[PDB]
Design a protein around this ligand. Structure first.
Ligand code: CA
Ligand code: CA
Ligand code: CA
Ligand code: CA
Lengths: 132, 318
């Protein structure tokens, strides 16, 4: 399937160490980097009903059986790590490294520069919209 | 073969350069020579039915192709190691970033200058095609620079994970690349050859000059439908300074019928690449790329990728 392709790439970044299973320690840091801040008791429950066998971690078969523009609004909220209404170069770089993707200084600076309409060196919501 | 000794015996391993889907790339240094490489750790599928990891069949194919390649515009393979969990590729270190990212730092770019980079890609593809190798994933992120701080940067084509030797037996099945760059024969599940790379080159060239993507639609379906229909245009918005020669180059590559599509040899004799007189030559020097839109495109592409990543994590996080 085509969906397999998507579920395979997600599993990889959730599975930070790549031993083949998602721990709740891994699931938590994945969600820290998505801008969330949940607690271990929440994290454990989420693991606890994807965890079909009941061995305390998520493997691919289990991950895969859990199957079922707006993605820009929500996406802005992830970039703006400190909630101040603006994405800085530092936020962009830090937030994307934590999502696996290693941007060069040059990539970062191109991104901000092309999105930054008013020239303050940061990207606000509307600016983000015009870019996307 | 795949060397079964411990790579750490022979290499110092450095910082992480990339974080692929079932792969990590780290910088490494060969101890004996002091020379730097990239080590790509490809995770093997742990059992036959597991959809996680890369099959041995796929890894051998990629390596078998890589071992054969020796050209200044294509990445070279130095050695290969294998442990229980991974196949470790010791590759030429290609650290200048993507071509488009380099170009996007420039004030201006003429068609002349653009073809100097284009020429290198075409020489690398002519070399591969002469060895009957189809890349099948030619797109701007696979066109890198060895070193971006020289006066004449050198193109390296990378990422041979979809590449095949063209032979009666299978060019096919895990051939699915990026919609905006795949030829109609790929989208329509028809015979594939060397010609699919030539289409990809027309799409790259189209974006090089304009900062627009020829067949892109709002969705993945429209995109694939536009590829299948060869439905594109040269919009005046993007292409008002683009030379007739360049348009014709693109036009003869963006052709449905793979047999009527220019070959790599045709493309190198084409007067946009190889002017026959000064007229064609000066025209190339007079004629400049839309750099405002090109920068917008390179940057938007990276923002589009990051969002797409976040949105994917987000869907599953719920
Ligand atoms: Ca893990
Ligand atoms: Ca489990
Ligand atoms: Ca901020
Ligand atoms: Ca701004």
């Amino acid at each position: 399937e085509e969906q397999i392709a998507e579920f395979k790439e997600a599993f990889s970044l959730f599975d930070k160490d790549g031993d083949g299973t998602i721990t709740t320690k891994e699931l938590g840091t994945v969600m820290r980097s998505l801008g969330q801040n949940p607690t271990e008791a929440e994290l454990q429950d989420m693991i606890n009903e994807v965890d079909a066998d009941g061995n305390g971690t998520i493997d691919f078969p289990e991950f895969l059986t859990m199957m079922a523009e707006e993605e820009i609004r929500e996406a802005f909220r992830v970039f703006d790590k400190d909630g101040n209404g603006y994405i800085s170069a530092a936020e962009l770089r830090h937030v994307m490294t934590n999502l696996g993707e290693k941007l060069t200084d040059e990539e970062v600076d191109e991104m901000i520069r092309e999105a930054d309409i008013d020239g303050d060196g940061q990207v606000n919501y509307e600016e983000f919209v015009q870019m996307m | 073969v795949f060397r079964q000794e411990n790579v750490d015996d022979y290499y110092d391993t450095g910082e992480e350069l990339g974080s692929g889907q079932f792969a990590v790339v780290k910088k490494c240094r060969e101890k004996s020579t002091g020379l730097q490489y990239a080590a790509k750790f490809i995770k093997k599928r742990r059992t036959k039915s597991s959809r996680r990891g890369v099959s041995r069949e796929d890894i051998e194919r990629e390596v078998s192709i890589l071992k054969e390649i020796q050209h200044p515009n294509v990445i070279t393979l130095h050695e290969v190691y294998e442990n229980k969990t991974d196949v470790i590729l010791i590759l030429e270190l290609v650290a200048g970033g993507e071509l488009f990212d380099f170009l996007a730092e420039k004030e201006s770019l003429t068609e002349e200058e653009a073809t100097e980079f284009l020429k290198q890609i075409l020489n690398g593809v002519y070399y591969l095609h002469s060895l009957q190798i189809a890349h099948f994933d030619l797109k701007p992120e696979n066109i890198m620079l060895l070193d971006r701080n020289v006066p004449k940067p050198r193109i390296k084509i990378i990422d041979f994970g979809l590449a095949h030797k063209i032979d009666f037996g299978n060019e096919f099945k895990n051939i699915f690349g990026t919609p905006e760059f795949v030829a109609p024969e790929i989208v329509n599940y028809e015979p594939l050859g060397l010609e699919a790379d030539m289409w990809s080159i027309g799409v790259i060239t189209y974006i090089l000059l304009s900062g627009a993507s020829p067949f892109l639609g709002d969705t993945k379906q429209e995109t694939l439908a536009n590829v299948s229909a060869v439905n594109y245009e040269f919009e005046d918005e993007y292409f008002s300074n683009t030379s007739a020669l360049a348009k014709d180059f693109i036009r003869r590559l963006l052709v449905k019928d793979p047999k009527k599509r220019m070959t790599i040899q045709d493309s190198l004799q084409h007067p946009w690449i190889k002017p026959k007189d000064t007229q064609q030559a000066l025209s190339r020097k007079a004629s400049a790329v839309n750099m405002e839109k090109f920068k917008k495109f390179a940057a938007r592409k990276k923002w589009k990728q990051s969002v797409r990543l976040i949105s994917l994590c987000q869907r599953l996080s719920r």
